[PDB]
Structure formats: C-alpha cells, structure tokens
Write an enzyme that holds these catalytic residues in place. Structure first.
Site, PDB file in Angstrom:
ATOM      1  N   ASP A   1     -12.423  35.678  -9.282  1.00  0.00           N
ATOM      2  CA  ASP A   1     -11.058  35.989  -9.609  1.00  0.00           C
ATOM      3  C   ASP A   1     -10.771  35.918 -11.105  1.00  0.00           C
ATOM      4  OD1 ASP A   1      -8.382  36.449  -9.715  1.00  0.00           O
ATOM      5  OD2 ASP A   1      -7.791  34.903  -8.297  1.00  0.00           O
ATOM      6  N   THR A   2     -10.782  37.097 -11.716  1.00  0.00           N
ATOM      7  CA  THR A   2     -10.497  37.238 -13.139  1.00  0.00           C
ATOM      8  C   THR A   2      -9.028  36.965 -13.481  1.00  0.00           C
ATOM      9  OG1 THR A   2     -10.089  39.679 -13.132  1.00  0.00           O
ATOM     10  CG2 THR A   2     -12.355  38.858 -13.521  1.00  0.00           C
ATOM     11  N   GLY A   3      -8.142  37.046 -12.493  1.00  0.00           N
ATOM     12  CA  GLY A   3      -6.742  36.646 -12.696  1.00  0.00           C
ATOM     13  C   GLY A   3      -6.489  35.149 -12.758  1.00  0.00           C
TER      14      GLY A   3
HETATM   15  C1  LIG Z   1      -1.076  35.823 -10.002  1.00  0.00           C
HETATM   16  C2  LIG Z   1      -2.188  35.447 -10.977  1.00  0.00           C
HETATM   17  C3  LIG Z   1      -1.717  35.678 -12.409  1.00  0.00           C
HETATM   18  C4  LIG Z   1      -2.770  34.046 -10.755  1.00  0.00           C
HETATM   19  N1  LIG Z   1      -3.306  33.884  -9.379  1.00  0.00           N
HETATM   20  C5  LIG Z   1      -4.680  34.412  -9.224  1.00  0.00           C
HETATM   21  C6  LIG Z   1      -4.558  35.647  -8.325  1.00  0.00           C
HETATM   22  O1  LIG Z   1      -5.775  36.398  -8.376  1.00  0.00           O
HETATM   23  C7  LIG Z   1      -4.184  35.401  -6.864  1.00  0.00           C
HETATM   24  C8  LIG Z   1      -5.288  34.733  -6.011  1.00  0.00           C
HETATM   25  C9  LIG Z   1      -4.894  34.599  -4.553  1.00  0.00           C
HETATM   26  C10 LIG Z   1      -5.473  35.421  -3.592  1.00  0.00           C
HETATM   27  C11 LIG Z   1      -5.109  35.372  -2.250  1.00  0.00           C
HETATM   28  C12 LIG Z   1      -4.139  34.471  -1.843  1.00  0.00           C
HETATM   29  C13 LIG Z   1      -3.556  33.634  -2.797  1.00  0.00           C
HETATM   30  C14 LIG Z   1      -3.934  33.683  -4.138  1.00  0.00           C
HETATM   31  N2  LIG Z   1      -3.839  36.723  -6.387  1.00  0.00           N
HETATM   32  C15 LIG Z   1      -2.672  37.131  -5.913  1.00  0.00           C
HETATM   33  O2  LIG Z   1      -1.664  36.461  -5.863  1.00  0.00           O
HETATM   34  O3  LIG Z   1      -2.649  38.502  -5.426  1.00  0.00           O
HETATM   35  C16 LIG Z   1      -1.541  38.885  -4.610  1.00  0.00           C
HETATM   36  C17 LIG Z   1      -1.331  40.361  -4.884  1.00  0.00           C
HETATM   37  O4  LIG Z   1      -2.269  41.032  -4.045  1.00  0.00           O
HETATM   38  C18 LIG Z   1      -2.362  40.281  -2.840  1.00  0.00           C
HETATM   39  O5  LIG Z   1      -3.716  40.156  -2.430  1.00  0.00           O
HETATM   40  C19 LIG Z   1      -4.152  38.808  -2.630  1.00  0.00           C
HETATM   41  C20 LIG Z   1      -2.909  37.946  -2.596  1.00  0.00           C
HETATM   42  C21 LIG Z   1      -1.825  38.890  -3.123  1.00  0.00           C
HETATM   43  S1  LIG Z   1      -3.056  32.421  -8.697  1.00  0.00           S
HETATM   44  O6  LIG Z   1      -3.683  32.484  -7.394  1.00  0.00           O
HETATM   45  O7  LIG Z   1      -1.627  32.197  -8.613  1.00  0.00           O
HETATM   46  C22 LIG Z   1      -3.743  31.260  -9.588  1.00  0.00           C
HETATM   47  C23 LIG Z   1      -3.087  30.661 -10.669  1.00  0.00           C
HETATM   48  C24 LIG Z   1      -3.703  29.706 -11.474  1.00  0.00           C
HETATM   49  C25 LIG Z   1      -5.021  29.332 -11.175  1.00  0.00           C
HETATM   50  N3  LIG Z   1      -5.670  28.400 -11.905  1.00  0.00           N
HETATM   51  C26 LIG Z   1      -5.697  29.917 -10.107  1.00  0.00           C
HETATM   52  C27 LIG Z   1      -5.068  30.890  -9.341  1.00  0.00           C
END
Ligand SMILES: CC(C)CN(C[C@@H](O)[C@H](Cc1ccccc1)NC(=O)O[C@H]1CO[C@H]2OCC[C@H]21)S(=O)(=O)c1ccc(N)cc1
EC number: 3.4.23.16
Lengths: 99, 99
Positions: free
Chosen positions: B25-27
C-alpha cells in the site's frame, strides 16, 4: 516513470482544467477526490476506509490526466483526507508495483 | 517481482511466525497490522483515513518478512480491516511504482 517510496507518491493530476495534487494509492480499490464540482449526473454512494464509512458522489466516465497518462473512469468525490488515485485508474495508466 | 493492480496487491508476510496476507500500500505512510499481541513496549497513536481515525499501538523494531524479503521497523497494530504494508517497509524491500 519509476517512483520510489521514501516520500509520498504525490503527483499532479489534471481534471477539468484544474491542476490538483493526488496520492498514487495501491491500497485503494477506488479513486476518491476531495470535495469539488464535476459536470454531469452523479449518484449518492457510500465507501469504507480505515476509520469507517463516508458518503460520496459517484461521477461516471470522468477523464483524469495522471503524469501525462490518460484515464477515463468512475470517480468518487467526498470527505477523503487527500485525493487518492486507486487501482481503478492506476490500471488504466499501466501502473505496477516492482521490487 | 512485478505486481499487477488488477487485483488488490496482497502478499504473504511473516511476523513472529504468524503468516498473514497484507496489502502492498503506497497510500500508507506506515505499516498497520490487524490486532495481535506482540511482545515488547509500545506507544499509543492515532491514524486517520477515509472514515476518520482509529487508535493503534506502535511497537518497536520488529522483524517482518515480506515475500522472502527481510524488513524490520516499528509497526502499528490495531483494529484495521486489513493488514497494510506501508512505505516505511516498502522502501526496505525495494518497492517502486512504475508506469
Ligand atoms: C486514505 C489513505 C491516504 C491512507 N489509507 C491507506 C489506504 O490505501 C487505504 C487502505 C485500506 C484498504 C482497505 C480497507 C481499509 C483501508 N485505502 C482506502 O481507504 O481505499 C478506499 C478507497 O477504495 C476502497 O478500496 C479499499 C478501501 C477503500 S489508510 O488506510 O487510512 C492508512 C492511513 C495511515 C496509515 N499509516 C496506514 C493506512
């Protein structure tokens, strides 16, 4: 290009004449953008992230230019912490993870 | 390897002889794992994304193997719906985004 990850993978996107900063996010299934106006019909949807669910507006078939690369697809607009480009559009531009 | 984004970038990791599936996860700035009771000291933190914040515990220097590549770092642990490998560890195993 090749992008390392010592810094956040933030790039400039073009969407409807506007230049915005967005995070290349391999952890997101879907592209979600901060509050903005887009033309055309949209539908109310919900999406869940790490902290719970939010309400979003789904706009279909929206072009975004991501570092010179064209994408056209579905975009969600709502209370994301930052513009995120997900797998939906990263696949369109040919993006992969390598190590 | 080269990892496609047609599907969620799930890979096997090992931490304290627990083998888990985790998202490349690059995000994510920092690695966060599903609730587990690791040994050693920790500090409390909060991280935010879509939906808001959750409370996690940051543990000190734990070895984690990711597809056979060795990493070690602080890791966050808490009620995330998915195991997430963030940039802190993606950089250690030589991961880039390419397109
Ligand atoms: C929103 C980002 C800037 C940060 N997020 C990482 C992110 O990749 C999450 C990672 C993630 C993935 C799945 C479930 C929860 C969190 N993805 C996410 O929220 O994507 C959403 C949009 O598309 C959908 O598909 C996946 C969930 C939805 S995060 O999960 O909140 C996060 C924040 C800080 C840290 N240290 C680790 C992770």
């Amino acid at each position: 290009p090749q992008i390392t990850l010592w810094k956040r993978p933030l790039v400039t996107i073009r969407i409807g004449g506007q230049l915005k900063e967005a995070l290349l996010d391999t952890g997101a299934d879907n592209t979600v953008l901060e509050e903005m106006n887009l033309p055309g019909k949209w539908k109310p949807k919900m999406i869940g992230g790490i902290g719970g669910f939010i309400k979003v507006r789904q706009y279909d078939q929206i072009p975004v230019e991501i570092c010179g690369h064209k994408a056209i697809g579905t975009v969600l607009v709502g209370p994301t912490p930052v513009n995120i480009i997900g797998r939906d559009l990263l696949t369109q531009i040919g993006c992969t993870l390598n190590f």
